[PDB]
Symmetry: C5
């Protein structure tokens, strides 16, 4: 017999009237193309530009009666990736590409096989940098949901319809790990049918829940953010007579805590709303600032102190020192409870 390359020349050549500019089943029902992606590499999720780089295998399956051969004895004929400009292909595109490219390492990474009944498998490797609106109302304890939509651009709903297959619409790699987030096993599948001034177009998308790993932020901006508050608590255990001791403590600590506040949003987007890490530094900033005002109240009584009425001012300046050793270690603990409970339920 003849090889599949010469066998398909009768179906993709000048004979049989086959044209790559004509969609299958013309003047009839639209083409129902089913798609399924395979995430190979994931990560590099930046927040300054609010985008993430993904590498998926976009599989496409449809039905073309013009390529339904019945003379070849086999059931699957592989095609050279250099002959993709001869058959019709869906005009699939993403609405959040923001720059993309293919891979042509020694061969155009394309897969093309034709079944006997007319099933055509089209799998390619695409490297996308997808964008998603980052919701940072609770930055250290948020559940991001970055989606990706597959719309049409040249054909409307009556000519091309995208759908998901029931046999693993979205597969995940075996050893796919992320440096900062984690990929949940549950991925939603809903439609995203858009409507413009020209018409209506099909759209398919899949939700991806990306939960953060609190192990990183808990060590860098939570343990040092708590030890600095302890530095302001040790001033109560120091005598009220040493002026340079408690003054230098209430100033060097209250100024190095601002660096922690400025160092908590160094690589974060400039959002207007307040996040969960801005209420942890601001409240702890009040503790390192109230300790400065605490010494300002103790030193103000000692500098004012008549022999009988002045002996009570010394005890009054020391009575507040007996409560500050218990108030702040018990008030900061109350805020430490309302913080790790409200942001663990919402």
């Amino acid at each position: 017999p003849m090889p599949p390359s010469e066998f398909l020349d009768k179906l993709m050549g000048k004979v049989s009237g086959y044209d790559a500019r004509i969609r299958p089943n013309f003047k009839g029902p639209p083409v129902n193309v089913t798609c399924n992606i395979f995430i190979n590499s994931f990560g590099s999720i930046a927040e300054t530009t609010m985008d993430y780089r993904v590498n998926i295998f976009l599989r496409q399956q449809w039905n073309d009666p013009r390529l339904a051969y019945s003379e070849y004895p086999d059931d699957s004929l592989d095609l050279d990736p250099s002959m993709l400009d001869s058959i019709w292909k869906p005009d699939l595109f993403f609405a959040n590409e923001k720059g993309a490219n293919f891979h042509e390492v020694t061969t155009d990474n394309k897969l093309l096989r034709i079944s006997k009944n007319g099933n055509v498998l089209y799998s390619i490797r695409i490297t996308l940098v997808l964008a998603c609106p980052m919701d940072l109302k609770n930055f250290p304890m948020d559940v991001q949901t970055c989606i990706m939509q597959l719309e049409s651009y040249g054909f409307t709903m009556n000519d091309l319809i995208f759908e998901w297959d029931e046999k693993g619409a979205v597969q995940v790699a075996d050893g796919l790990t992320l440096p900062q987030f984690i990929l949940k096993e549950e991925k939603d599948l809903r439609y995203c049918t858009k409507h413009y001034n020209t018409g209506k177009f099909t759209c398919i998308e899949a939700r991806f829940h990306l939960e953060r790993q609190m192990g990183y932020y808990l060590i860098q901006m939570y343990i040092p953010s708590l030890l600095i508050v302890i530095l302001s608590w040790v001033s109560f255990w120091i005598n009220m007579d040493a002026a340079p001791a408690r003054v230098g403590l209430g100033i060097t600590t209250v100024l190095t805590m601002t660096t922690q506040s400025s160092g908590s949003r160094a690589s974060l987007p400039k959002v207007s709303y307040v996040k969960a890490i801005d209420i942890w530094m601001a409240v702890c900033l009040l503790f390192v600032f109230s300790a400065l005002l605490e010494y300002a109240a103790v030193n103000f009584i000692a500098r004012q102190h008549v022999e009988e009425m002045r002996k009570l001012f010394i005890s009054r300046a020391k009575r507040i020192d007996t409560v500050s050793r218990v108030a702040f270690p018990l008030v900061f603990l109350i805020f430490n409870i309302f913080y790790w409970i409200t942001y663990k339920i919402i």
Copy 2:
């Protein structure tokens, strides 16, 4: 009958004398091309290079009598995006491109349909990085106006005219949100007819008002910029005898405020004029510097103090301490009123 691919070969082939290098209605009136864009993604507005990345759908509509078919029973014939090099297309370009590229993810993102009367719709996806002169006279409270002009390069006014359509000249996406700014619903539409040494060319543009969100700057460079001034106010409530207490306070605070001034223009363009954030740090720098000179005036009187005339110098050195507790908390409030009123009207 015959499919539209073979039907349009009579209108785009060697027959009928149709050439892609000839504009419609030659030796007559110019081609009136109407355009309308659809902003899909917006943001990433940097200030060091004074540019912003945009992703729009550039729709183009004109009239070509050479493509006015009258035999096909339908009213809209879709075209393959691979056949855009056969018909005439307007030479539309932007005067502020500064690098651009198309999107060819599995298909050239182009839309092409031809009506019966000769209406040709041309919609493509372009990713532009547009530039605009940043007016930073009031940096935290400015209303930026970044525009984009669509000029001609090969045809003059007598051969190609660009205009805006009245049915939604500029559409906005449904869920288009910006991280730093906000997009106003009012967009101006005016002409930008340029004149060069070669001739005159058409030009269409649309204004985009981008108001900032003060919620970000108010927390990072306004709350810490005010608490440092309070650190210089607590020196008045400290006795005038402790030298290392008030000296270290008037130096550590006046030097950490300069870091806030240098940290306020870390990612800003090097402009010559003064902005609204440079007058907030410089005036607050005077308060943290006047407190240093305030102790220099109190300590200078105590070191100079004859038994009757010296008792008044001690009261004089304490009389200024009774006014500094009221002057600065009431003078900084006056500047706090003139600042948030002048920059809220202009």
Copy 3:
């Protein structure tokens, strides 16, 4: 006779039925392609994106009976790199490309020679940026293993099989040096046969062990991380009466050590687990923090001190000063032993 260019036109032209879209030995055994790479340049191994740039010479050898000439008197015929689109080539690709490109400096860097029996050598220069999951459980003393897999995309196992040659499967350059790591002479060779929903494909890979050089981290983040602890030890040799001396020492040192902790993960990925450099700064942070609490215990006894019972409190406040000069210099040495032994065996 005729030159090899005209001699091979009979084997690569329209005659002999040779087609570049047909794999050798069709309807029979699969093509056994042996590959061997030659690493020219290596390094630039970043950790923020977890990727490294490599430049190898990908050699490919297979058997094509359709190109087995028997009339030319020579044994090796060199081919012009501009004629690679006429013969069949394996669709080799990498599963961790993440962007790649060829080199076309004055000539496409391709090697093509055909033997008499049908051996075809295919060598090209590819610049890859390969990714690997960075295991940073012990950051300064880890042995990274970055691999690279060569999979198929268009042909399954029954049509294309990749294998390694026994004569130097992976060669290393003569003067290939790395700035940070070192390349070990032992490189493992194992298979990576994947299984997808479409079928099974061949895969070959080679392990690369990249041991770090501790000479860099030992000087920058280990010598200064130890001298700061010595600054907290000198407070014991200072009299317990000078308040501003020991207070300023226990605060300026405990706050500059946090900068060393924040400066140890400035260019590191945001991992959740704790690494070996996070337990060296945190434990040393306890020493510079216990010295602050040590003075808080000595000053608390002196401020409390009845004529006979008060003379023992002065000796008690000095007895702890006689143990702190020996405890911390001997407790930090114990942690210094358990650290450099546990992380030198695992």
Copy 4:
């Protein structure tokens, strides 16, 4: 009649012997090509790499007798930008390109019109990143001169000559503003004829004077650079008995001034010569360092002070304090005059 597309096929087709590989007026005088650029966008002038990005419209005009039509009734025939590979074009190139690209947004931005006498206008949009040797002998008050040369590569002087036109050789945009520098209205026009081992080639260039805007540097690195010196002057108004007051002032200020010196060359090229900003920080570093040595001379006399001879040492230690309040405020003013006069004339 026939359209210009079919009319010019007789002049650009196989007939008439017109070839795009032959320069006009062969075996005779060279082609005198006149050029004129139009700067659209300017700025982004970095100093680390010593380059600036420019966007100009390169117009080219020459004479081609082979295209001198005499049958068409019009005087200017516009050409499709897709037919630039049919006529001869000058091989113009820049000697300081360092990477460049064109703009192909929906159309190749090319202009091509042919006059009756043979005048051919060629205007294209080129985005260049031009380099210039940065002369930073006086960094805040220099007048940079970045030029751009247009050389030939394939034709020598006897075959191609570039010249400037007298009617606006270099035009400037109407609203072209720069963020840091300013563009002067005077632009020099001189030749740059080079000589290599192959021969001599034509060259045209234009000088661009880029004066800096001192409004930026005067606020960031000149006002804080002067207030720190004032902090060292207030130590003279403090009593000579307070040791921790004047010691902490002469150390915290002398160390934060080094940050201003290191912060003045953070984004500057590593040049060997000294600039005008390195002599302003180094001299001011002497003032904040002489104040430290001033207290070292006052405290050395007080610690040495026999009942009559010791009373003069106290007055001697205070006599220098009466001159330091007048010397430094009058010596720093002398350097402030010689600095803003020498660098305002050269």
Copy 5:
């Protein structure tokens, strides 16, 4: 007669049997191609990636008897750069490209002329980013030697040999200046013949000595690195009774010197060996650390001081103060001599 474009069609057309896939002098001696480069732009030598960007004019000259015309009366025929795919060209490539590109600004920057005897000149503009192993054993006083090799990829030694010409093998631009380094006039020329598993290939290279300019490092990291040591010397001229004076001096200076050590390797590669700038900061770190231990020895004697034996401890605590004023100013000078002598000979 006929123009050179039509004259060379007889030598580059279907007639005469000329093929671009055949090297000259086949079945005979190899082609001796002589090359000579012309460095136009040089600099941008980074150290994090260990690469430098260069822009050279790669001239190539060989002998092709098939192009030896004898009928044209001239001696040099210029060729259009669009016809380089018709003649044979050497497959020259660099072994350290790491990404490269050509320049196509309005014309492919290629030079092609053919002599009567068969001499063919081939000059193109290539922008390379070449790599070299940075030897940083003495960072401020090293002599870097970055080379560039020109190897073959498709032809072995018996088919293509590269050589250097004796008439200026490597030329330098007239006004080529470097921001950091300097280019020496002496450039070595040696062979780099490599040997692989396939065979042996020709190779030509040229050495480039790049000496650093010490004027930059001497001001930024050598003058401030010496003044901080002077701050530790002034503590000896202060009385031994002021505790907060000498304690704060021996801590604030010893901690700001570590920033100079961390600030000396901010943009340097992470090498394991010690460089010449790491022994200048570490030794100076001992001086600012020995001054802290010097006060720890003086204060330890004063706190210990029986009426006759205690008067000698006061003199002993002051005797070391009389030697420290002379020891350190004379010991640091000894290290200052051995440093600037050992690294000025090797």
